[PDB]
Amino acid sequence: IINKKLDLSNVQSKCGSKDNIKHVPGGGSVQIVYKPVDLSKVTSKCGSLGNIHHKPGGGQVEVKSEKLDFKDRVQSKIGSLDNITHVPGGGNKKIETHKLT
Amino acid sequence: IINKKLDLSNVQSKCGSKDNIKHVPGGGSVQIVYKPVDLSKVTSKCGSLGNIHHKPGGGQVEVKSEKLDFKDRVQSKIGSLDNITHVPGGGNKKIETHKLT
Amino acid sequence: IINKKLDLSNVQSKCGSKDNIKHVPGGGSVQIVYKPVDLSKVTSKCGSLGNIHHKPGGGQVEVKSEKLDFKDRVQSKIGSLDNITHVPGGGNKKIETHKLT
């Protein structure tokens, strides 16, 4: 057996994944999650009197509120968010999340 | 056996995936999730008196509210969001999420 | 057995993942999570009288509130957020999260 490799690679694996994003306002509220997953390989070669301009755009997020009025009560009442029971275990009994009786 | 490789590759795998995104406002609210998955390979070669301009556009997100009025109560009442029971386990018994009795 | 490699690679693995992001305001509130996952390989070669400009854009997040008024009570009442029971264990009994009786 002869095993030979040149690994000159670029890898992103399982990146930026399985995020759980919740925004639950009463009112007048902004949530921004800015999560690009970017893999860039750039090999600019410039001889003689050439020019290379490499200026790809980035992400822009703009939120503008010019006027916002709430003239009466802003109220949130949350008993729960996001109840989860995972239980990959073998032989478990009476496993409970958010039990009301 | 002879195994020979040149791995000069670019890979994104399982990136930016399985996000759980919830926006549950009473009112007057913005959620922005900016999540592009971008793989770019660029090999600009510029000889003599050439010019290369490489300026691909980025993402733009703009939200503008010029006027917004709520003249009476803004109210949210949430008993739950997003109840999940996964249970990949073997022989489990009486497994409960969000049980009301 | 002969095993030979050149590992000249760039790797991001499981980066920026499984974040649990919650914004639960009464009102008038901003949450920004800025989490790009970026892998950049750049090999600019510039001979003679060439120019290389390498200026790819970054992320911009702007939130502007010009006027915002709440003229009455802003109230949040939270019994819970995000109850979770994991229990990958063997043979556990009477395992409870957020139990009300």
Author numbering:
A (entry chain B), B (entry chain C), C (entry chain A): 277 to 377
The paper states:
The formation of amyloid filaments through templated seeding is believed to underlie the propagation of pathology in most human neurodegenerative diseases. A widely used model system to study this process is to seed amyloid filament formation in cultured cells using human brain extracts. Studying templated seeding in cultured cells, and determining the structures of the resulting filaments, can thus provide insights into the cellular aspects underlying neurodegenerative diseases.
Although the resulting filament structures differed from those of the brain seeds, some degrees of structural templating were observed.
